[PDB]
């Protein structure tokens, strides 16, 4: 069972309201929604899935919201996107109960950031995971090699030969929002 974004390569992150709207208009399927307002939240999730498009839910960047167990019962029971990205562990384990794609956020920060990342990895078992940034092939290279969990890669990509790059790499997809390259591909 390969995860649900087969064949698709980039996976528009929005920043906006208004950037939702600009993807909103593409044929690409699933997209990703980076900062958002609890408020506000419920109706964006349902809108987007309205215009069949599959959200990946930023479970940190909920302004107002936790990443707490309780905060993550609230995005699986009553917001409902189609996943979540977390870069805490609590949560992958809390999402994967509720029976939801669960993608764990990693930083190539510095080989200490590596080194607890793939062991938290290892502990919470994530359906995937997104590396940043993505302009690494090579760090992309090294971690698939590792355990297979798939792993999407996002941050800093600016050309398509960089996607092509990362993707070649290991990477099953490319997150972005570089506006240029989401009507590219």
């Known amino acids: 069972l390969e995860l649900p974004f ?11 309201q208004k950037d939702m709207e600009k993807i909103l208009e593409l044929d690409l399927t699933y997209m990703v929604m980076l900062e ?8 964006l999730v349902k809108y987007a899935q309205a ?4 959200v990946l839910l930023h479970a940190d960047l909920v302004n107002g919201l936790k990443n707490d167990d309780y905060a993550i019962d609230f995005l699986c029971t009553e917001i409902c996107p189609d996943g979540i990205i977390s870069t805490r562990g609590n949560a992958i384990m809390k999402a994967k109960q509720h029976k939801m794609l669960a993608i764990q956020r990693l930083f190539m ?4 950031a590596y080194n607890k990342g793939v062991a938290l990895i290892q502990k919470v078992q994530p359906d995937c995971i997104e590396l940043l940034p993505g302009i690494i092939p090579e760090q ?7 355990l297979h969990i798939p ?3 996002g941050g800093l990509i600016e ?5 092509n790059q990362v993707i070649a790499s290991g990477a099953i997809a490319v997150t972005t929002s570089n506006k240029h390259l989401w009507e590219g591909h």
Request: aromatic residues 0%.
């Open 159 to 163: 050309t398509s030969e960089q996607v």
């Open 140 to 146: 992309v290279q090294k971690m698939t090699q590792k």
């Open 51 to 54: 215009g069949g498009k599959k």
């Open 109 to 112: 920060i510095d080989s200490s």
């Open 6 to 16: 087969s064949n698709q390569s980039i996976i528009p992150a929005a920043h906006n």
């Open 36 to 43: 958002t307002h609890v408020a506000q939240l419920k109706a």
């Open 151 to 153: 792993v999407i890669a």
